[PDB]
Structure 1
Amino acid sequence: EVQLQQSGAELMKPGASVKISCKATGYTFSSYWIEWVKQRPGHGLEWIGEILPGSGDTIFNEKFKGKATFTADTSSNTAYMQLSSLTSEDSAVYYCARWVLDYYGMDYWGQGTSLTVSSASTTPPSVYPLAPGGSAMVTLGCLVKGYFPEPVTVVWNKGSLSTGTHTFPAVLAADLYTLSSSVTVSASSWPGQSVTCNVAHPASSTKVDKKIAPS
């Protein structure tokens, strides 16, 4: 079975350089061209260039001639793409894909490598309780604001409250992340019983427990 495995997500600072790998298995690596593609939010897909492992021949999209460099090692069946002088415009997901001549296309694709070029520093979040404005059900929540980088984890009552929990996707606001999580429980269980959100932000080794009390 043909497979292309790429290196993991990269976090680089402006001006740095990164080398993304693409390991092939399931076929004769030296016989097929490897294509490199760039996927940047709001910019569709861009072709970077290609390399034929068996000959080492390379062809670049003019635009990337001074940004990318292709290499390959037939002994380890791995292709590599190095990006230099990184800038925020280089932030994107990069893919390698196999081109088959008689197919006239790219059939198998790597899983992609997410590259983030940033100079931002780790920032802990501020955690705030979300109570109703003082039905059979009641919705409580917790706001996790101003943290970087992602992610943060949120549990309710130390994992005891699991059903009815909605941890929403994070969004940016002033260069930082904001997330919220909510739990819907029986109106007869709160405030009659306690509801506490447990927030953790590994990157900053911060842990905050916030009890949701009536307003």
Structure 2
Amino acid sequence: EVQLQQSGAELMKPGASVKISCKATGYTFSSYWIEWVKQRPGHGLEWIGEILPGSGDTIFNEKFKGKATFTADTSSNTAYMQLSSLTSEDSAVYYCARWVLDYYGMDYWGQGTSLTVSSASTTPPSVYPLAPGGSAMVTLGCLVKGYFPEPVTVVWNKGSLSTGTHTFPAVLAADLYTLSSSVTVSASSWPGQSVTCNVAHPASSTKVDKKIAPS
């Protein structure tokens, strides 16, 4: 039952410092090298370096010598990597992985830790109804624009409408997030009946109910 558990997501400001942990279980932690890897969109995978807990010996990708520091605790069976002077280029998902000598490779990987280095402030979204251009089915929607940070939740008719719902992944539009959700219902239920989307943005603690009305 070999497992490596890493610390949760991090949101840091430029110039700060973060310490990512990697807890091992199911094996003798001091006897295996622990690799650290950086995954940034459009940059595939970079090897930061590695550490052997038993000896404390390390090996760094020269490019990361002044950025990362490796530590380990054979008492708590945990390895850590600290990244200093954070910049936007440090934003990515970091992984620790076990290297086994006789195998000559990395077998078990941690789940990864998402580091977001930003100076953006919490911003509530604007919610706008999406109605058809005025078939057996009809699709209605809601636009959730300009919020930060993720996420937002969208339900229809307070959850009473669940089937036929499509809440899409968000995308960045000028440094803020934009998301949309749609619901497809029988053409006979709308406008016949009411359809309301309920949007919530926990971070800004904002909630908006917008009824979809024929244009």
Q: What TM-score bracket applies, with the shorter chain setting the length?
A: over 0.9
1:190 — aligned with what?
Answer: 190
* Structure 1 Cα separation of the partners of residues 200 and 179 of structure 2: 12
Give CA deviations for 1:94-119 in whole Å, capped at 9, x if unaligned.
Answer: 00000001100000000000000000
* Structure 1 Cα separation of the partners of residues 91 and 195 of structure 2: 40
Give 1:174 deviation, angstroms.
0.6
SS of match in other structure, 1:19 = strand
Give CA deviations for 1:105-137 in whole Å, capped at 9, x if unaligned.
Answer: 000000000000000000000000000010111
* Structure 2 Cα separation of the partners of residues 129 and 61 of structure 1: 51
SS of match in other structure, 1:89 = helix
Give 1:37 deviation, angstroms.
0.4
Give 1:140 deviation, angstroms.
0.3
How many aligned residue pairs are there?
Answer: 215
Question: Which sections of structure 1, spanning at least 5 residues, go unmatched?
Answer: none
Give 1:50 deviation, angstroms.
0.5
TM-score, reference length from structure 1: 1.00
Identity %: 100
Give CA deviations for 1:72-96 in whole Å, capped at 9, x if unaligned.
Answer: 0000000000000000000000000
Give 1:147 deviation, angstroms.
0.2
* Structure 1 Cα separation of the partners of residues 59 and 136 of structure 2: 65
SS of match in other structure, 2:143 = strand
Give CA deviations for 1:160-214 in whole Å, capped at 9, x if unaligned.
Answer: 0000000001000010000000000011000000000000000000000000000
* Structure 2 Cα separation of the partners of residues 189 and 39 of structure 1: 47
* Structure 1 Cα separation of the partners of residues 101 and 174 of structure 2: 48
Question: Which sections of structure 2, spanning at least 5 residues, go unmatched?
Answer: none
Give 1:3 deviation, angstroms.
0.2
Report whether the alignment pairs 1:115 with 2:96: no
* Structure 1 Cα separation of the partners of residues 83 and 185 of structure 2: 50
SS of match in other structure, 2:107 = strand
Give 1:42 deviation, angstroms.
0.4
Provide the alpha-carbon RMSD of the alignment.
Answer: 0.3
Give CA deviations for 1:34-65 in whole Å, capped at 9, x if unaligned.
Answer: 00000011000000000000000011000000
Give 1:9 deviation, angstroms.
0.4
* Structure 2 Cα separation of the partners of residues 169 and 97 of structure 1: 29
SS of match in other structure, 1:49 = strand
Give 1:18 deviation, angstroms.
0.1
* Structure 1 Cα separation of the partners of residues 33 and 187 of structure 2: 62
